């Protein structure tokens, strides 16, 4: 009397639109801006719920209580704006990728937005370059 | 000199923190308010990055030019809620479930918002039952 369908493929399409839309910068309601030492400063949009559905510290800042008024800007430091435009492209595509004289400060800014797969795949690499 | 990691699952997971939102409440950015015939009407929460995704028609519904002013309400006729509750669970979830009784409406639903994995779906299942 019921009948129940799962399209396998479908959160790996529509993660493809919403990075997207990320590049096209369309509803975007987040304004990454990013100023690490003596680098240009640079910004990122993105979707400030698939941040939160990839880092519990997105998540945690984006969630505080009465839902925000319209695009916000949050200023990143400590982070070098190479890595966070990795690590935004992991939430958006599930992949990351890095010259191996990055794997540290990738893994650095995992850490720092408690992203635990790269965590653990840049931690794995380390210790198998010993 | 380069490594690269892909995370299988993570699209998978993502969209169940981002249907852990919706429930809650949380970043949510349009109400779709369904008021069909004769039933009472209902309402849904949800995030428009999230059913752009999963829906051409609601992509291009809130893609229109300058991006919106906060919370936005969007009237929906023609689909009963209940099938609108099942369509925004396939695009939250990848996953739809409906009595034999019901699969011609969310079929019609489906091709109303272009979802068209599920239209494949119910078609096939519509002709199996001859």
Same mark, same amino acid.
């Given at each position: 009397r019921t009948f129940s369908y799962t399209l396998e493929d479908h959160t790996k399409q529509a993660f493809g639109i919403m990075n997207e839309l990320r590049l096209s910068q369309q509803l975007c309601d987040v304004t990454? @801006?990013?100023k690490y030492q003596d680098a240009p400063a640079a910004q %990122?949009?993105?979707?400030?719920?698939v *941040?939160?559905?990839?880092?519990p510290v997105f998540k945690? !800042? %984006?969630?505080?209580?009465l839902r925000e008024q319209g695009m916000e800007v949050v200023s990143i430091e400590g982070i070098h704006p190479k890595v966070m435009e +990795? *690590?935004?492209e992991f939430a958006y595509t599930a992949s990351i990728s890095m #010259?191996?004289?990055?794997? *540290?400060?990738? !893994?650095? #800014?995992?850490v720092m937005? @408690?992203?635990?797969?790269?965590? +653990?795949?840049?931690?794995? %690499? *380390?210790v198998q370059q010993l």
């Open positions: 990454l @801006q990013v %990122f949009m993105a979707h400030k719920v *941040l939160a559905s990839s880092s945690a !800042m %984006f969630t505080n209580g +990795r *690590l935004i #010259g191996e004289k990055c794997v *540290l400060h990738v !893994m650095n #800014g995992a937005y @408690q992203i635990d797969s790269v965590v +653990r795949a840049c931690a794995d %690499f *380390l």
